[PDB]
Amino acid sequence: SGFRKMAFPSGKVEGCMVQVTCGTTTLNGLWLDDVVYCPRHVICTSEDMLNPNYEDLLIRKSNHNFLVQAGNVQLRVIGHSMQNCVLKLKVDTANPKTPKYKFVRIQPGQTFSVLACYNGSPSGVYQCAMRPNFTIKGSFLNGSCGSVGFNIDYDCVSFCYMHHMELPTGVHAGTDLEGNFYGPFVDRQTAQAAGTDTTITVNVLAWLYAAVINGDRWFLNRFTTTLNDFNLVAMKYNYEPLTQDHVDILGPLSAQTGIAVLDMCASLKELLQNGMNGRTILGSALLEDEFTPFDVVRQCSG
Amino acid sequence: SGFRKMAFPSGKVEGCMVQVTCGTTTLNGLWLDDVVYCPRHVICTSEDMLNPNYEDLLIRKSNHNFLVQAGNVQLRVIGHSMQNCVLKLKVDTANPKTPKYKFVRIQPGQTFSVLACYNGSPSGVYQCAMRPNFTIKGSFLNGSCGSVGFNIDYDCVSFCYMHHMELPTGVHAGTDLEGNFYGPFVDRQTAQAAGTDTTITVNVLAWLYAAVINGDRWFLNRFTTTLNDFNLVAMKYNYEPLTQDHVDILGPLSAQTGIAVLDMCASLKELLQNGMNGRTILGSALLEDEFTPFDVVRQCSG
Ligand SMILES: *[C@H](S)C(=O)c1ccc(Br)cc1
Ligand SMILES: *[C@H](S)C(=O)c1ccc(Br)cc1
User: Fold this and answer.
1) Does residue B188 have its Cβ closer than 6 Å to ligand 2?
2) Where does the Peptidase C30 domain start and stop, copy by copy (chains A, B)?
């Protein structure tokens, strides 16, 4: 019993974290086989923030301009290239700790674990979700760029995020591991800001099922709703539309609790319209939307 | 920016997790140097739950009754002994992955990271706090006993918890790594239950400072209070008393924000008396008490 914001064990990723220095700029890199991945912003200088031309900046560098440190061991850089917003530094040594891995791009509403790192040294691990507006509500300080987000399935690490920058509302933006940004952001200094965000409905419903599995039942009711009527209410409260695929994905949790998805939707409608009247659900006083149906099934009793 | 419930990176502990089997009972163990630590309940059988005499149960076992598996490698048990509620299995091989480590017992109100494990395999990592009533609000399923809680300082893992059981309210009880329970619980089947709990005041204040460091300021006010008047209100709301040592420990955060501790106390008093009127703090709609002053300083900008 119990329900926590749980991350994947971070050991497989810890063994891949390195420090990358170019000029007076230091940040984190990810060492897999004989390649180190890092943000290309590492080749900028203090004056280059406004309109860097990265192709120009990179053609003026050579391998010896990149210092890579894995713990207390300097890795010799033997090639360098750029792919979208990331840099690929070929080193003369394959990381002996490389896990089985994949580079996957995730969808808004999906969750992942972040290993926050400074100077190539892991500092903490936490769970995040990709918001509908393609930002993440991370916890990052200066020097954390290059930190990665991931999921682990069996023995395989699916890397899905590399951290780049912080937007003016304190939320975070980054790329997949092919260097393509999530959302309409760029690695340069502009007035860019997070766009409007919405709540991830299917996740809220998953979390209500978690609560029922864990014995919070006070928000249940004898009502049902149609998907259309539910989605009318959802729209009114800035919630994403619920699709039939979402209903299908909630099938297992529905079956385990014996609560039809559209019955749980009726509960959510009442909670949106009435609040919780001073009660809590799984120790929260607001509706939590950063657990996927998969997260609930993995953590909760069967 | 940002503030998350952050755990320590778990890799150093992952390399210590093993599976311990006795009869038809399997659970997790912790392998450090040439010793494996696990709950002594592993030597119980289905009939022994009510009033086990562990001394008797153990004298009837020998080394070959204990199967220890580290990944795909069977560790040969060469001695066995009991220390309070844990078992110590001497194995013929020192764990090559043993980190620098300590066995520390923690105080109510202190936090630690939990590596939830099943069958000796790590499954997730999350942050917890020891409640004033010596329970923890964990996330544990059947088979998780033997999972450990820890903090990491520099390179040194301070183990502080081994998981044993779940109480009837769904909260969890366990021991330190010398096998002594936290709180008035025992490793046998009784009507034992969590006693009354209280909110950890100094932690709530630490978290309000986190929020100010992160730009939530709406709950601040121009008032101050005395420690005595504050503690009168605290008592009324089931909050722990605030001591001068607590005020001193909050000194750094006070200095960084320029908000005197007793001014922040005045804010907390108003929040207890009035609620938040539909606002949130660091994405919560209730007052969070599972971050210590140290946790805030470590995670937050300086
Ligand atoms: C450092 S966290 C980094 O990579 C970076 C990327 C993009 C911008 Br804009 C600033 C800093
Ligand atoms: C398994 S999680 C275990 O160690 C245990 C300890 C004490 C009691 Br009572 C039940 C199970």
Assistant:
1) yes
2) 1-302
- Closest C-alpha among A68, A43, A47, A45 to residue A58: A43
**Structure-determination technique:** X-ray
d(CA A218, CA A208): 11
- Closest to A184 in 3D by CA, of A135, A128, A129: A135
Half-sphere exposure of B206 (CA within 13 A, CB side): 28
Amino acid identity, position A118: Y
Best CA proximity match to A285, nearest among B214, B279, B269, B235: B279
The Cα B130–Cα B150 span in angstroms is 12
Q: Rounded to an integer, what distance in angstroms lies between the CA atom of residue B16 and that of residue B152?
A: 14
Token duo for residue A131? 């918001």
Strands (E), chain A: 17-22, 25-32, 35-39, 66-70, 73-75, 77-83, 86-91, 101-103, 111-118, 121-129, 148-153, 156-166, 172-175
Sign of the C-alpha dihedral, residues A93, A98, A101, A102? negative
Q: How far is CA A63 from CA A39, A70, A92, B171, B262, in A?
A: 16, 17, 11, 55, 56
Task: Determine if ligand 2 sits within 6 Å of the CB of residue B166.
Answer: no
Resolution of this model in Å is 1.7
Please give the radius of gyration of chain A, using alpha carbons only, rounded to the nearest integer. 22
d(CA B41, CA B20): 11
Q: Which residues pair with B147 in a beta bridge?
A: none
Residue at token pair 């140290």: B294
Residue of A4, A141, A282 to mutate, testing the B interface (most B Cβ within 10 Å of its Cβ): A4
Domains and their CATH numbers in chain B: 1-14+100-197 (2.40.10.10), 15-99 (2.40.10.10), 198-301 (1.10.1840.10)
Region label for A202, one of left (φ > 0), alpha (ψ between -120 and 50) or beta (otherwise):
alpha
Distance of CA A164 to the CA centre of its chain: 12
User: Which amino acids of B are annotated catalytic?
Assistant: 41, 145
Q: Which of B46, B57, B164 to mutate to test the pocket of ligand 2 (most atoms within 8 A of CB)?
A: B164
- Report the DSSP pairing between strands A156-166 and A101-103: parallel
Question: What secondary structure, in 3-state letters, does chain B show?
Answer: CCCCCCECCCHHHHCCEEEEEECCEEEEEEEECCEEEEEHHHHCCHHHHCCCCHHHHHHCCCHHHEEEEECCEEECEEEEEEECCEEEEEECCCCCCCCCEEECCCCCCCEEEEEEEECCEEEEEEEEECCCCCCECCCCCCCCCCCEEEEEECCEEEEEEEEEEECCCCCEEEECCCCCECCCCCCCCCCCCCCCCCECHHHHHHHHHHHHHCCCCCCCCCCCCCHHHHHHHHHHCCECCCCHHHHHHCHHHHHHHCCCHHHHHHHHHHHHHHCCCCCCECCECCCCCCCCHHHHHHHCCC
